[PDB]
Every structure is written in structure tokens, then in C-alpha cells.
Amino acid sequence: SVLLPQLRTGWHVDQAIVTETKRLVVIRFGRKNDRQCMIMDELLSSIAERVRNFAVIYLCDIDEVSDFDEMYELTDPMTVMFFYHNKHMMCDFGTGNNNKLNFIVDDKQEMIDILETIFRGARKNKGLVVSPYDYNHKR
RNA sequence: GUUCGCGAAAUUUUACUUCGUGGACAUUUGGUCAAUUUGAAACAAUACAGAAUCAGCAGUUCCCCUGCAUAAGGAUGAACCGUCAAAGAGAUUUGUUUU
């Protein structure tokens, strides 16, 4: 958890998205007290060093910044989201919501494969990517 | 209350109509192509998932064979033997077989 930096204003979020051209921007929207928010914080905290080349991971709190709540429709304790060149990325996970992310991923390798596949499909301008894993038993 | 099935009646055995009877009798979600159009905001155009394959040499790493170099190291053969050159001056001797 301490490994990943946190974004304390909406402008740190926005500039974090704008100033980074060549690698994905991954934000976890959620609060420190939640049960599901710390788990993806640990999972993403282990993965950050492997992936630092082709992606970077940041942290955002909903109570700290409530500005994006209505715009991206943030519900559930946590939503992970993926941004490439200011463009919100999108991938059909089988969860029925191709936007953002909700559930807690299990294995490191499955999440690194999601990051890798979203990245690779993102370099081609492709809006929708198809994950190798449809988890929809979860949602 | 809806259908399927069996028994009874009114008529031409199956058929309609009604009685006695055995089941079956929920709705949704997980279902978005991406890319592009100077405006009070709609899915209307514009694409439309088409969103290179055989062969050759060389080069790094080790091994062997054969050359040439270099550093060291060895083995053996080779018939004949070492304390000047020129010019000038002085001193001593010099009848017949092989010319």
C-alpha cells in the first residue's frame, strides 16, 4: 500500500493522465477503510515494479476527491480504471460493464495479462479490448 | 385463471361443449464493434474487423588436424689444424741423371 503513491486532488489525477504518453495510467478509486479496496491495493502494489515500463499505477480516494463521482458514475467500494492519452480505455470483461473495473482480481499473472492486453490493444487506438479471462461468475 | 392427459353426457367412435380428475404452471442481468463528422443533442452518416513467406554466409564458445611466427628447451650430422697490405731508408749472404 505504501509502495503506490496517492492522488490528493483532481488535478493530480488529470495531470497524471496527461503528462504520461507512453504507458497506461491505472487508477484505483476507493477508500482506505474498505475491505475490497485494500486487497486490490496489495495486488497492484506487488505488480507495480514489474509493470513500471508499460504501465503506472496510482491511488485516488473518493472522499478526498468527490469530483469524478458523477462523471464516471463511481459506485461500489472500488473501481480500477485505465487511461491512455487522455482517452478512457475500455475492455469487455464479461462482467457486462465494459467500463472501469469492479471485482478483486485473484492472481498476479491474470492481472498482468489484463494490463498487458489492454496496453497492446491501446497502442493501436483500439477502444475495446477482449480480456483472455471472462470472469463473469464474479461481476 | 393457461395448457396437456384419462372417465361421463348431448350428437355421426377421432371433433366441440360441459362435469369428475394427474401434472406442468416466474421476470430480468451477465448482449455496447472499435475508428471518424464547428455546437442547443440524437444514433444519423463514414469506414466494416483485410483494424508477408522460403533460403544462404558470416560471427561468439570449445575440440581435432595441418602450417608459419615467437619464446624457451633439447638430439644428431657436416674431413684436416690462425700469434696484415703497399712504399721508403739502413745491415748480412749468393764437365754428365730433375728442365
Which residues neighbour A85 within 8 Å (Cβ) at sequence distance 6 or greater?
A21
Q: Report CA(A93)–C1'(B62) in Å, whole number.
A: 53
- The length of chain A, given as a count of residues: 139
Strand B footprint at Cβ < 7 Å? A 87, 90, 92, 94-99, 124-128, 134, 136-137, 139
Q: Report CA(A65)–C1'(B35) in Å, whole number.
A: 33
Domain span at residue A130 reads 1-139
Cell of A94: 464479461
Number of domains in chain A: 1
**CATH number of the domain to which A94 belongs:** 3.40.30.10
Q: What angle do CA A57, A73, A68 make, to 5 degrees?
A: 60
Are A122 and A129 a contacting pair, CB within 8 Å? yes
Q: What is the 3-state secondary structure (H, E, C) of chain A?
A: CCCCCEECCHHHHHHHHHCCCCCEEEEEEECCCCHHHHHHHHHHHHHHHHHCCCEEEEEECCCCCCCCHHHHCCCCCEEEEEEECCEECEEECCCCCCCCCCCCCCCHHHHHHHHHHHHHHHHCCCCEEECCCCCCCCC
- Resolution, expressed in angstroms to one decimal: 3.4
Q: Report CA(A64)–C1'(B60) in Å, whole number.
A: 58
CA dist A92 and A133 (Å) reads: 10
Q: What angle do CA A129, A135, A138 make, to 5 degrees?
A: 130
CA–C1' nearest nucleotide, residue A127: B34
